[PDB]
């Protein structure tokens, strides 16, 4: 392979370039970095990405990081491969970037914060207390992430959780505002905007889940039809089938 | 004019498309939205950008918002005008976006938070207490900004300020890490990466200022030479001269 993707599979930030690769029909080696073994903190992976986070794209010896950047990189380099995922119209491509950067600056983080608090409790508590601290202190380069791991194992402040939940509500209302009126986030059709937002939103509609009161047929029919729509796409089904 | 920029002039988020326009030699109407009169919350400006924030680009009846997006839009639409501000090499253009999104997701906000706390005290306190609250409650659409205005007039929590200061330190160390070794943030030369970071960093080196202990010749010679370098560019001098 001349293209390799290092990631956690199809969820959160990893899903963005994974979906992009399958939508564009690009051949690549799908490398699973196993979070249950903290492989993102392994010496061999930090050689690929010294930040110690996924996703990371390897292309002919060059490493591209940041999920949103990798997707734009794939469109910059393979504009003629499979589905075209940025509008040709520059005004529509601008609108697309407003959506993708909003995922990076707002939507991903409130959902993620709730995920760190409740979602990876088992990984977060695998090691003994000192073994945990040993790993964090010498193998997690990123300070903001050191604190997140500590709070994942030991607890997030309550008022922090309350605020994060409110922002999820804001985020879901914003999506519904648009998706209740059109099929995709930019009206030129399916784009990186949909992919980046789907990366965060897919799973929120789970009955009995964390956000069932926010995302459902009654409150957000637009959002739900969009989630269904993207999940019906052949490349998205292929992504989940082969992961 | 077919191009108009609505902004606060050459500082913070407004500086990014302003510098881009001058670097590309593009003709445009420079429209000053006066923050001392809260014009960003005026009915006439919210018609242009319903978010009630600057900058906003008007181009033939189309409005482009988000400072970083506007710069990319100008390169998408006028790639052959004046200085070229994105690398032609897609791997280098990816590296550029890592820098610009890092401004949007980290660097701008810690600097900005300190700015809201200490910087706009006079505007923040212009109106009476009820007149202040009246304006905030009916004329500032954005919730996160309602709270920022309240904290600008009434006070930010101490521990919040301490943390924000630490992140500024992290931000400045990261810049020095690169600029101590090369002239511009991406080694292909001056780009939107430099402009977006300069928008936040310019002014930090002010003697007797907020961040004099972080940014100076002793601690960050690389950062300081870069600041000087960009300030010597003819288009940047022109920007400040004509603002
Ligand atoms: N800004 C980065 C964030 C990357 C990121 O947060 N990755 C998460 C997975 S969604 C991760 O690596 N978590 C493992 C860890 O921090 O230990 C991007 O969009 O790629
Ligand atoms: N994400 C937006 C942020 C825009 C923004 O924060 N603008 C500030 C000036 S730097 C503003 O309008 N402040 C006025 C207010 O919120 O009332 C962008 O990069 O354009």
Author numbering:
A (entry chain A), B (entry chain A): 0 to 242
Study authors write:
Following oxidation of the α-hydroxyl group in GGE by a Cα-dehydrogenase, stereospecific glutathione (GSH)-dependent cleavage of the β-ether linkage in β-(3′-methoxyphenoxy)-γ-hydroxypropiovanillone (MPHPV) is catalyzed by the glutathione S-transferase (GST) enzymes LigE and LigF, forming β-glutathionyl-γ-hydroxypropiovanillone (GS-HPV) and guaiacol. LigE catalyzes stereospecific cleavage of (βR)-MPHPV to (βS)-GS-HPV, whereas LigF catalyzes the cleavage of (βS)-MPHPV to (βR)-GS-HPV. Consistent with their classification as GST enzymes, LigE and LigF each adopt the canonical GST domain fold with an N-terminal thioredoxin domain (residues 1–82 and 1–76, respectively) and a C-terminal α-helical domain (residues 93–255 and 93–242, respectively) connected by a short linker (residues 83–92 and 77–92, respectively). Biochemical and small angle x-ray scattering data suggest that both LigE and LigF exist as dimers in solution, and these dimers, related by 2-fold symmetry, can be seen in the respective crystal structures.
LigFΔ242-GSH crystallized in the space group P6322 with one molecule in the asymmetric unit. Well defined electron density corresponding to the GSH molecule is also visible in the structure. The LigF dimer forms via interactions between helices α3 and α4, in the thioredoxin and C-terminal domains, respectively, of each monomer, forming a four-helix bundle. The dimer interface is largely polar, lacking the traditional lock-and-key motif or hydrophobic surface common in other GST dimers, specifically the Alpha, Pi, and Mu classes. The LigF dimer more closes matches those of the Beta or Theta class, which, like LigF, lack a hydrophobic lock-and-key motif, and there is no open V-shape to the dimer interface. In LigF, Glu-65 and Ser-66 located in the turn connecting β4 and α3, recognize the γ-glutamyl moiety of GSH as part of the ββα motif. Additionally, Gln-52 and the backbone of Val-53 interact with the cysteinyl moiety, whereas Gln-144, His-40, Tyr-148, and Gln-39 anchor the glycine residue of the active site GSH molecule. Due to the occlusion of one face of the GSH binding pocket in LigF, we propose that the substrate binding site is located on the opposite face of the LigF monomer from the dimer interface (black circle). Because LigF Ser-13 was the only potential acid-base catalyst revealed in the active site of the LigFΔ242-GSH structure, we hypothesized that an SN2-type nucleophilic attack mechanism is responsible for catalysis in LigF. Based on our data, LigF is best placed in a new structural class closely related to GSTFuAs or as a fungal Ure2p-like GST based on structural similarities and function in saprotrophic organisms, although it does not strictly fit the class.
